[PDB]
Design a protein around this ligand. Structure first.
Ligand SMILES: CCCCCCCCCCCCCCCCCC(=O)OC[C@H](COP(=O)([O-])OCC(O)COP(=O)([O-])OC[C@@H](COC(=O)CCCCCCCCCCCCCCCCC)OC(=O)CCCCCCCCCCCCCCCCC)OC(=O)CCCCCCCCCCCCCCCCC
Ligand SMILES: CCCCCCCCCCCCCCCCCC(=O)OC[C@H](COP(=O)([O-])OCC(O)COP(=O)([O-])OC[C@@H](COC(=O)CCCCCCCCCCCCCCCCC)OC(=O)CCCCCCCCCCCCCCCCC)OC(=O)CCCCCCCCCCCCCCCCC
Ligand SMILES: C[C@@H]1CC[C@@]2(OC1)O[C@H]1C[C@H]3[C@@H]4CC=C5C[C@@H](OCCC(CO[C@H]6O[C@H](CO)[C@@H](O[C@H]7O[C@H](CO)[C@@H](O)[C@H](O)[C@H]7O)[C@H](O)[C@H]6O)CO[C@H]6O[C@H](CO)[C@@H](O[C@H]7O[C@H](CO)[C@@H](O)[C@H](O)[C@H]7O)[C@H](O)[C@H]6O)CC[C@]5(C)[C@H]4CC[C@]3(C)[C@H]1[C@@H]2C
Ligand SMILES: CCCCCCCCCCCCCCCCCC(=O)O[C@@H](COC(=O)CCCCCCCCCCCCCCC)COP(=O)(O)OC[C@H](O)CO
Ligand SMILES: CCCCCCCCCCCCCCCCCC(=O)O[C@@H](COC(=O)CCCCCCCCCCCCCCC)COP(=O)(O)OC[C@H](O)CO
Ligand SMILES: CCCCCCCCCCCCCCCCCC(=O)O[C@@H](COC(=O)CCCCCCCCCCCCCCC)COP(=O)(O)OC[C@H](O)CO
Ligand SMILES: CCCCCCCCCCCCCCCCCC(=O)OC[C@H](COP(=O)(O)O)OC(=O)CCCCCCCCCCCCCCCCC
Ligand SMILES: CCCCCCCCCCCCCCCCCC(=O)OC[C@H](COP(=O)(O)O)OC(=O)CCCCCCCCCCCCCCCCC
Lengths: 64, 71, 174, 239, 100, 98, 35, 125, 55, 94, 101
C-alpha cells in the first residue's frame, strides 16, 4: 500500500491499492469494491494465478 | 557528468531493447498459449490464457521466485 | 536446496543455543544462527541488512552477551536440569504451533509447482527500471530521514533510555 | 515549514525540558563545590513544572494539534479523542510526581534520573496515544516499557526491586516479541501497516469463509500483547 | 516455493525461541537468549515480506526493531548483572521471594 | 553486411541514435507509458527498430574503420566511455553527430 | 457508522500521495524516460 | 440453530470418551510440567518422564470416564424417558461427577459436591 | 557436542526440510478439492438459510 | 546484483582449508568488573550510530536540508547521552 | 520535502495569513502574548529558586527554571499569535490590522 518500491520505483501493487482505496472512498457499501480488493490481494500473493497454473500441471501429470 | 553521459547513452537505446524484448515475450506467450490449449483440451469450463485480474490490466506472469533479478 | 542447507544449519545451531549446558557455548552458537541469517539475507538481495546483522547482532550484541556470560563464571549446578520430562509438553506446543504456523501462508500464498517446462522464457524484462538501479542502502536512506523521521528520532530516544539505565543500575564509581 | 511543527509543540517542549533537566542534574549532582547535593526533589519540582507547561500548551492549542495532518499522516494522527487522552495522561503524571517528594527526602532516594525516566516514559505514552500505524505503536510501546524496566529496578541493592525488574524485563520482552510477530503477520498478509489502510482492507469481510489466517493470527498475537499490557488474565501474573 | 521456505526458516527460529523458554526453567540467561531468537525471527519476517510485496515499509521497521533489540539486551543484561550482584548467584531459587 | 546490434554497437552509437531516432523513441515511450502490454506496442517497436538498424547500416557505410575500432574498444572495456575517448573522437570526426 | 471509511478524515492517503507522486523512489520508471 | 449433525448415541458416548481422554492427557501434561521434580530425582532424567507419562495416563483415564459417562447417561435418560430438556444431562452430569470424582477422591461428601456442581453447569447450558 | 554429532544433526535437519518440501507440494496439490468442499458446504448453507427464511 | 558475493564464499572455503592444513601438519611429525559491561554498552550505542550513518551518508544528495537536520537531531539526543556518560565517569578507567 | 499546512478542522475566523513566516508571527506578538510569556517565565524562575534552596544551588536552579520557562512561554506566545493569524483563534486585532495595511 505505501507505494515505495524496494528498487526505488513505484511498488508493484500500488496502482491496484490506489484503485481499491479510491473506490472505497465513495462507495458506501464495501461489496461494491470487492473486485478491486481481490485484484490488490491477487497482486500481493498471486494465489489464483498459481492455483490455475497448478491445475494445468495437474492435468499434465494426469494425462501422462 | 560522467555518470549522466552513461545514463543518457542507456536512455537512447532503451526503446530498441524494449521492442526486441516485447517481440520475444509475445512469441513465447503465443507458444505457451498453444501448449496450454493442448494440455487443457478435454477439460470442461477452461478458458485458455484467462486473465485472473478483474480489471483485465496486463501484468507479467508471476514467477514464484522471491528475488530473481539480483542473481 | 541451498535454503534447505541454511535452514538445517540454523535449526541445529538454534537447538544448540537452547540446549547447550555451558552458556558461553550458547552465545557462540547464537553467533552461528546470525551468520546463517545473514546468508539468507544475501539470498534475498538485501546486502545492507546482511552486513548490519553481522555488525550489530554479532559485532555488538553478542559481544555484550559474551562479556557478561564469561565474567559470570556460571557453575552448571546452578542452571542444570533434566529435560527428558519436557518432551510431551514441547510435543503438543510444538506440534500445534507447527501445524498452524508453518502452513499459515499456504492458503494465502499457494506455491507454484515447478513443472517439466521451461517457464524461464516467460520472464518479462522491463529495461526502464534498470537505467539507474538503486542499492538497498540508498533506497532505505531515501526514507529514514525525511518521510519517516519521527520514528527514527523515537528510536534515538530508546537508545538514550538504554544509556541512562545502564549507568544508573550498574555504575559504582571508584 | 516551522508552522508544520505546531502539531508537535507539546512533545517538542517536554522532550527539550527533559534534556535540560538531565543536563542540570548531571552537572550539579557531580559538583564537589556544592558537595554532591541530592537533586531528586529539585529536578522533580522542575519536571512537575514542565509537565504542567506541556499540559497548558496541549490544552490551549486544541485546533493547532491537527494542523498539517496530511504531512503528518504517515507518522501519527491527532484528533478529539487523542486530545482528551493526552490531557488525562499528563494530569496523572503530574499527580504521581507530586506524590514523590516525601519519598525522595525521607528515604533519601537521591537519583534525579528517576524523574527523567518518568518524563521520557510520558513522552512515549503521548506518542502511544497518537499512534496510527503498527510501527509507531510498537516503537512508542517499547520506549514506555524500557523506561518502566529501568525504574522498577531503581532500588538496585534491594532483593525485591531487582527481582521485580528481572521478572518485568523477561515477561515484557516475551510479550513484545509476540506482539511484533502479530504485526509482521498482518503486514505480510495485507501489505499495510497504517491504520487507515488496515481499516479499508479488513472492512466488509471479517470471516467470509475465505479468511486470511495470516490476518486472523496477527490480530490474535497483537491482542495477546495488549492483554499482557492491561494485566488481563491469563497474561497478568507479572503485575 | 521460495516464500514458504523463507517463512519456515524464520518460523523454526521463532519456535526454537519458544522451546528455549519452555526447556530452560533453571536458566534465565538462556530465556533472554530465546527472546532474542524470537525477535530475530520477527525481523526476518519483515524483510522477507518487504521483498515478496515489493514494499519498503518492512525494511524501515526492521532497522528500528534492531534498535529496540539492542536497547532491550543492554537493559536486560544490566538487570541480570545487578540481580547477580545482590545474590551472588543466578539460580532461580534466589529470585522467587515475591509470591502469592 | 549489417552489424550485429550487440550491446557494444548500440552503446557506441547511442549518441547518433538519440539524435536520429528521437521521434520514434519518444512515440514508443509514450505508448509504453499508456500501456505496458507488449502486444499493444509492437508497431511503434517496429518503427524504432527500423530507424535504428537503418542508422546502424548508414554509420557502418560511412566510417567502417573508426566504427570498428570504437566498437571494439567499447566491448573490451564493457561500454565504459572514459576508457575509449581517443577512438570516440576519431569516430565522431568522420561520422559527425549533426 | 455507514461507510465511515468514506469520511474525509479517513481518506488522508488519497490526498497526500498525489502530492509526492513525482518523488524519486515511487515514480513509474517510464516517467524518467519522458521527462 | 442446531441442525448440523448426524448424532448416534453410541457414537456420542464413544466420541465423548475420546475427547475426554484428549483433554485429560493435555491436562495431565500441563500439571506434570508445572510441578517441580523431587530432590532425589534432579540428576536422573528417566523417572521424571515416567511420572509425567503416568500423570498423563491417569488424567486421560479419569477425564475419559467423565466425558463418556456424562453423555451416556444423558442419552440413556432422553431415550427411555423420550424427552429433550436440560433435565436430561443434569442427571448425567450428577452421576458422572459423583461416580468418577468420588472414586478418585474416596469421599461421599465430595461426590455429592461434584455431582451438584456438574449439574448446575449442564443446567446453565 | 562432538563435531561429527553436529554434522549428523545437520544431515537429519536437511532430511527434515526436504520432507517439509514434500508436505508443501501435497498441500498445494489439494487446493482444488478443498475449494470444491468449501463450495459444496457454502451451497448447502445457503440453501438451508433460504429455506428457513421461507417460513 | 549479488553476483560478487560468490567469490567471497569460495575465498572463505579456501582460507579455511589453508588454516586446517597449517594447523594440522604438526600433528604428524570469578572477578566481575562492571566496566567491561559499560564499554560494551557504549560500543553498542555508537555501533548503531554508525549503522544509521551509512544510509544517510549515501543519501545526502537526495534528502537535502531536511535529512541533514533530522540526523543532527538524532545526534543531539545521542550526544546528550554521551555527555551524561562522560560526567558520570563511564569513560574513566582509573 | 513536500509540505501541506492544511488542517483537519478548518479555521472558524478570517484567515489573515495561511502559513505565516516565523518573524511575522513573532512581530505579531500582542500585549497579551507578552503577558503570557512573562508570567510563565516568572513562575518558572520562582519554582527554580524555591526548589533549589535545599540542595544549595538556588542560583543555577533559577537559571534552569528560567530556561524552561522562557522556552515554554515563547512556544505558547507563538502558538497564540500563529493561531490568530491563521484564523484558528479569535483574531479581531489581526483582521483590523490586515484590512488597513
Ligand atoms: C554413506 C556415507 C558414509 C560416509 C559418511 C558418514 C559420515 C558419518 C555420519 C555422520 C555423523 C553421524 C554420527 C554422529 C556422531 C556419532 C559419533 C559420536 O561419537 O557421537 C557421540 C554422541 C554423544 O554426544 P556428544 O557429541 O559427545 O556431546 C555430548 C554433550 O551433549 C555435549 O554437550 P553440549 O552442551 O555441546 O550439547 C548439549 C546436548 C545437545 O542437545 C541436542 O543436540 C539435542 C539432541 C536431540 C536432537 C533432536 C533432533 C535434532 C536434529 C534436527 C532434526 C529435525 C528436527 C525438527 C524439529 C522441528 C520440527 C517441529 O547434547 C546432547 O544432547 C547430545 C545428543 C546427541 C544426539 C543427536 C541425535 C540427533 C537426532 C537424530 C535423529 C535421527 C532421525 C533420522 C530422520 C530425522 C527426520 C528427518 O552420541 C551419539 O552417538 C549421538 C550422535 C549420533 C546420532 C546423531 C547423528 C544422526 C545422523 C543420522 C544420519 C542422517 C540421516 C538423514 C540422511 C538424509 C539423507 C538425504
Ligand atoms: C563446498 C564446501 C566444502 C566444505 C568442506 C569442509 C567440510 C567440513 C566437514 C566436517 C564434518 C566432518 C568432521 C569429521 C571429524 C573431524 C575430526 C575432529 O572432529 O577433530 C577436530 C578437533 C575437535 O574435534 P572433536 O573431537 O569433535 O571435539 C569437539 C568438542 O571438543 C567437543 O566438546 P563439547 O561437547 O564440550 O562441545 C563444545 C563445543 C564448543 O563450543 C562451541 O560453541 C563450538 C563453536 C561453535 C561456534 C563458534 C563460532 C562462533 C564464535 C565466533 C567466532 C568468530 C565469528 C566471526 C568469524 C567467523 C565467521 C565467518 O564444541 C562443539 O560444539 C563443536 C561443534 C561444531 C559446530 C560449529 C562448526 C559448524 C559451523 C558451520 C559450518 C558450515 C559449513 C559446514 C556445513 C556445510 C553443510 C553441511 O579439533 C578441531 O576442530 C580443530 C579446531 C579448529 C576448528 C576451526 C573451525 C573454524 C573455526 C573458525 C570459524 C568459526 C565460525 C565457523 C564457520 C562459520 C561459517 C560462517
Ligand atoms: C565478512 C564475514 C565473513 C563471513 C561472511 O560474511 C561475514 O561472508 C559472507 C559470504 C556469504 C556467502 C556469499 C555467497 C553465497 C552464495 C549464495 O548462493 C547463490 C545462490 C543464488 C544464485 O544461484 C544461481 O543464480 C542464477 C539462477 O537463479 C544463476 O544464473 C544462471 O541462470 C540465469 C537465468 O536462466 C541465467 O540468465 C544466467 O546466465 C545463468 O548463469 C547463477 O549462475 C547462480 O549463481 C540462488 O540460486 C538458487 O535459487 C533459485 C531460486 O530460489 C533456486 O531455484 C530452484 O527453485 C525454483 C522455484 O522456486 C525452480 O524454478 C528452479 O528450477 C529450482 O532450481 C535454486 O536453488 C538456485 O538457482 C548462498 C549464500 C552464500 C553462500 C553466502 C553465505 C553467507 C556468507 C558466507 C557470508 C558470511 C556470513
Ligand atoms: C497431541 C495431543 C492431542 C491429544 C492427545 C490424545 C491422544 C490422541 C488423540 C487425538 O488425536 O486427539 C483427539 C482428541 O483431542 C482433542 O481434540 C482434545 C480435546 C479438546 C477439548 C478440550 C476441552 C476444554 C477446552 C482427536 O481425535 P481425532 O484425531 O480422531 O479427531 C479428528 C479431528 O477431526 C481432528 O483431529
Ligand atoms: C551533535 C550535533 C547536534 C546538533 C544540534 C543542533 C541541531 C538539532 C536539530 C534542530 C532542528 C533543526 C534546527 C536547524 C534550523 C534550520 C532548519 C532549516 O533550515 O529549514 C529546513 C527544513 O528543516 C527541517 O524542517 C528539518 C527539521 C529536523 C527535525 C528536528 C525534530 C524537531 C521535532 C520533531 C518532532 C517529532 C517528535 C520527535 C521524536 C523524538 C528548510 O528545508 P526546505 O523546506 O527548504 O526543504 C527540505 C529539504 O531541503 C529537502 O528534503
Ligand atoms: C505550589 C508549588 C510552588 C513552588 C513549590 C516550591 C518547591 C520547593 C518548596 C518545597 C517546600 C520547602 O521548601 O520545604 C522547606 C521549608 O518549607 C517551606 O518553608 C516552604 C518553601 C516555599 C513554599 C511556600 C513559599 C511560597 C510559595 C508560593 C508559591 C510559589 C523544608 O522544610 P523544613 O525542613 O525547614 O521544616 C521545618 C519546619 O518545622 C516545617 O514546619
Ligand atoms: C529532540 C530534538 C532535538 C533538536 C531540537 C529541536 C528543537 C529546536 C529547534 C531550534 C531551531 C528553531 C528555529 O530556528 O526556528 C526558527 C526559524 C526562523 O528563522 P529566522 O526567521 O531567522 O528566525 O524557523 C525556520 O524557518 C526553520 C524551521 C526549523 C524547524 C523547527 C523544528 C522545531 C520547532 C520547535 C521550536 C520550539 C521553539 C523555539 C523557536 C525559537 C528558536 C530560536
Ligand atoms: C532547548 C534546546 C537545547 C536543550 C538542551 C540544552 C539546554 C541548555 C543547558 C541547560 C542545563 C542547565 C544550565 C544551568 C546553568 C546554571 C549557571 C550557573 O551556575 O548559575 C550560577 C550563577 C551565579 O550565581 P551563584 O550560584 O549565586 O554563584 O548564575 C546565577 O545564579 C544567575 C541567577 C540570575 C538569573 C535569573 C534569570 C534567569 C532567566 C532565564 C535565563
Amino acid at each position: 500500500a505505501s507505494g515505495w518500491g524496494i528498487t526505488g520505483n513505484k511498488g508493484r501493487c500500488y496502482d491496484f491499492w490506489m484503485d481499491f482505496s479510491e473506490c472505497m472512498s465513495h462507495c458506501r457499501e464495501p461489496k461494491d469494491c470487492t473486485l478491486l480488493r481481490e485484484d490488490y490481494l491477487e497482486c500481493l500473493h498471486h494465489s489464483k494465478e498459481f492455483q490455475r497454473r497448478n491445475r494445468i500441471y495437474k492435468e499434465e501429470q494426469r494425462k501422462l | 557528468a560522467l555518470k549522466e553521459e552513461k545514463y543518457a547513452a542507456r536512455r537512447t537505446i532503451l526503446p530498441i531493447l524494449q521492442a526486441e524484448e516485447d517481440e520475444r515475450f509475445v512469441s513465447e506467450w503465443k507458444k505457451y498459449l498453444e501448449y496450454e490449449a493442448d494440455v487443457m483440451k478435454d477439460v470442461p469450463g477452461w478458458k485458455v490464457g484467462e486473465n485472473v485480474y478483474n480489471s483485465g490490466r496486463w501484468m507479467p506472469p508471476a514467477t514464484g521466485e522471491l528475488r530473481p533479478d539480483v542473481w | 536446496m541451498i535454503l534447505s542447507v541454511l535452514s538445517s544449519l540454523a535449526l541445529v545451531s538454534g537447538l544448540m543455543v537452547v540446549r547447550a549446558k555451558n552458556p558461553v557455548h550458547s552465545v557462540l552458537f547464537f553467533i552461528l544462527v546470525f551468520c546463517d541469517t545473514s546468508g539468507l539475507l544475501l539470498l534475498l538481495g538485501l546486502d545492507f541488512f546482511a552486513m548490519i546483522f553481522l555488525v550489530v547482532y554479532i559485532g555488538a550484541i553478542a559481544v555484550l552477551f559474551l562479556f557478561v556470560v564469561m565474567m559470570f563464571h556460571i557453575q552448571i549446578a546452578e542452571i542444570h536440569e533434566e529435560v527428558l520430562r519436557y518432551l510431551p509438553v514441547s510435543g503438543i506446543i510444538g506440534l500445534i504451533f507447527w501445524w498452524e504456523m508453518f502452513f499459515i501462508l499456504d492458503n494465502e500464498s499457494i506455491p507454484l509447482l515447478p513443472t517439466q517446462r521451461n517457464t524461464t522464457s516467460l520472464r518479462y524484462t522491463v529495461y526502464a527500471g534498470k537505467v539507474r538501479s538503486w542499492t538497498n542502502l540508498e533506497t532505505l536512506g531515501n526514507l529514514l530521514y525525511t518521510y519517516y523521521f519521527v520514528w527514527f528520532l523515537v528510536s534515538s530516544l530508546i537508545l538514550l533510555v538504554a544509556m541512562i539505565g545502564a549507568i544508573v543500575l550498574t555504575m559504582h564509581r571508584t | 515549514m516551522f508552522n508544520l511543527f505546531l502539531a508537535v509543540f507539546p512533545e517538542i517542549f517536554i522532550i527539550n525540558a527533559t534534556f535540560i533537566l538531565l543536563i542540570h542534574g548531571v552537572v550539579f549532582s557531580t559538583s564537589k563545590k556544592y558537595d554532591y547535593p541530592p537533586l531528586a526533589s529539585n529536578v522533580g519540582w522542575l519536571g512537575l513544572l514542565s509537565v504542567l507547561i506541556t499540559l497548558l500548551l496541549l490544552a490551549a492549542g486544541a485546533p493547532l494539534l491537527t494542523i498539517a495532518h496530511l504531512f503528518w499522516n504517515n507518522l501519527f494522527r491527532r484528533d478529539n479523542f487523542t486530545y482528551f487522552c493526552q490531557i488525562f495522561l499528563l494530569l496523572s503524571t503530574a499527580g504521581t510526581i507530586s506524590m514523590c517528594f516525601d519519598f525522595f527526602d525521607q528515604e533519601r532516594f537521591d537519583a534525579f534520573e528517576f524523574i527523567v525516566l518518568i518524563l521520557l516514559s510520558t513522552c512515549g505514552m503521548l506518542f502511544m496515544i497518537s499512534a496510527y500505524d503498527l510501527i509507531a505503536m510498537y516503537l512508542a510501546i517499547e520506549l514506555q516499557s524500557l523506561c518502566f524496566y529501568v525504574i522498577a529496578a531503581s532500588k538496585r541493592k534491594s532483593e525485591f526491586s531487582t527481582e521485580a525488574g528481572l521478572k518485568y524485563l523477561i515477561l515484557g520482552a516475551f510479550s513484545s516479541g509476540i506482539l511484533l510477530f502479530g504485526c509482521s503477520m498482518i503486514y505480510g498478509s495485507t501489505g499495510a501497516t497504517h491504520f487507515d489502510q488496515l481499516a479499508k482492507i479488513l472492512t466488509g469481510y471479517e470471516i467470509t469463509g475465505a479468511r486470511s489466517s495470516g490476518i486472523f493470527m496477527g490480530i490474535l498475537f497483537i491482542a495477546v500483547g495488549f492483554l499482557f499490557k492491561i494485566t488481563a488474565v491469563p497474561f497478568h501474573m507479572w503485575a | 516455493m521460495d516464500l514458504i521456505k523463507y517463512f519456515t526458516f524464520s518460523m523454526i527460529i521463532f519456535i526454537l525461541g519458544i522451546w528455549g523458554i519452555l526447556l530452560n526453567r533453571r536458566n534465565i540467561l538462556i530465556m533472554l537468549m530465546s527472546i532474542e531468537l524470537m525477535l530475530l525471527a520477527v525481523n526476518l519476517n519483515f524483510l522477507v515480506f518487504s521483498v515478496s510485496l515489493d514494499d519498503m515499509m518492512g525494511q524501515v521497521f526492521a532497522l528500528l526493531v534492531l534498535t529496540v533489540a539492542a536497547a532491550e539486551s543492554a537493559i536486560g543484561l544490566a538487570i541480570f548483572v545487578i540481580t547477580f550482584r545482590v545474590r551472588g548467584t543466578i539460580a532461580v531459587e534466589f529470585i522467587n521471594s515475591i509470591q502469592g | 553486411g549489417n552489424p550485429i546490434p550487440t550491446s557494444a554497437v548500440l552503446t557506441a552509437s547511442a549518441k547518433h541514435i538519440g539524435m536520429r531516432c528521437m521521434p520514434e523513441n519518444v512515440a514508443f515511450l509514450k505508448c509504453k507509458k499508456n500501456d505496458p502490454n507488449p502486444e499493444k506496442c509492437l508497431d511503434k517497436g517496429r518503427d524504432v527498430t527500423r530507424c535504428v538498424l537503418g542508422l546502424l547500416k548508414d554509420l557502418h557505410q560511412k566510417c567502417q574503420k573508426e566504427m570498428d575500432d570504437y566498437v571494439g574498444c567499447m566491448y573490451y572495456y564493457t561500454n565504459e566511455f572514459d576508457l575509449c575517448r581517443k577512438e570516440q573522437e576519431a569516430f565522431e570526426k568522420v561520422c559527425p553527430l549533426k | 457508522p455507514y461507510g465511515f471509511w468514506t469520511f474525509e478524515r479517513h481518506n488522508a492517503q488519497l490526498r497526500w500521495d498525489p502530492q509526492i507522486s513525482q518523488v524519486a523512489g515511487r515514480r513509474d520508471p517510464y516517467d524518467d524516460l519522458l521527462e | 440453530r442446531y441442525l448440523e449433525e448426524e448424532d448416534g448415541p453410541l457414537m456420542k458416548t464413544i466420541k465423548g470418551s475420546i475427547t475426554g481422554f484428549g483433554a485429560g492427557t493435555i491436562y495431565g501434561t500441563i500439571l506434570a510440567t508445572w510441578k517441580d521434580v523431587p530432590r532425589v530425582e534432579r540428576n536422573v532424567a528417566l523417572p521424571g518422564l515416567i511420572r509425567t507419562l503416568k500423570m498423563m495416563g491417569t488424567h486421560g483415564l479419569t477425564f475419559a470416564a467423565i466425558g463418556g459417562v456424562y453423555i451416556g447417561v444423558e442419552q440413556l435418560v432422553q431415550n427411555f424417558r423420550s424427552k429433550r430438556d436440560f433435565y436430561n444431562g443434569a442427571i448425567g452430569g450428577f452421576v458422572a461427577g459423583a461416580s468418577v470424582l468420588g472414586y478418585r477422591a474416596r469421599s461421599i461428601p465430595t461426590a455429592i459436591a461434584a455431582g451438584a456442581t456438574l449439574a448446575v453447569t449442564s443446567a446453565l447450558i | 557436542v562432538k563435531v561429527l554429532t553436529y554434522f549428523g544433526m545437520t544431515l537429519a535437519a536437511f532430511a527434515f526440510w526436504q520432507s517439509m518440501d514434500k508436505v508443501h507440494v501435497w498441500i498445494a496439490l489439494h487446493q482444488d478439492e478443498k475449494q470444491e468442499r468449501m463450495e459444496k458446504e457454502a451451497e448447502v448453507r445457503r440453501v438451508r438459510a433460504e429455506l428457513l427464511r421461507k417460513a | 546484483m549479488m553476483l560478487e558475493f560468490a567469490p567471497i564464499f569460495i575465498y572463505l572455503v579456501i582460507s579455511l582449508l589453508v588454516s586446517l592444513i597449517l594447523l594440522g601438519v604438526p600433528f604428524l611429525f570469578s572477578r566481575f568488573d562492571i566496566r567491561f559491561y559499560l564499554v560494551s554498552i557504549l560500543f553498542l550505542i555508537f555501533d548503531l550510530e554508525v549503522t544509521f550513518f551509512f544510509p544517510w551518508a549515501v543519501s545526502l544528495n537526495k534528502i537535502d536540508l531536511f535529512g541533514f537536520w533530522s540526523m543532527m537531531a538524532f545526534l543531539f539526543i545521542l550526544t546528550i547521552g554521551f555527555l551524561y556518560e562522560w560526567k558520570r565517569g563511564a569513560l574513566d578507567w582509573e | 520535502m513536500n509540505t501541506d499546512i492544511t488542517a483537519l478542522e478548518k479555521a472558524q475566523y478570517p484567515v489573515v495569513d495561511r502559513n505565516p513566516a516565523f518573524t511575522k508571527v513573532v512581530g505579531n506578538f500582542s500585549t497579551l502574548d507578552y503577558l503570557r510569556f512573562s508570567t510563565i517565565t516568572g513562575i518558572s524562575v520562582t519554582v527554580g529558586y524555591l526548589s533549589g534552596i535545599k540542595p544549595g544551588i538556588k542560583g543555577p536552579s533559577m537559571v534552569t527554571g528560567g530556561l524552561i520557562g522562557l522556552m515554554g512561554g515563547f512556544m505558547y506566545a507563538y502558538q497564540n499569535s500563529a493561531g490568530r493569524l491563521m484564523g484558528f483563534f479569535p483574531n479581531d486585532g489581526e483582521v483590523a490590522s490586515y484590512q488597513k495595511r
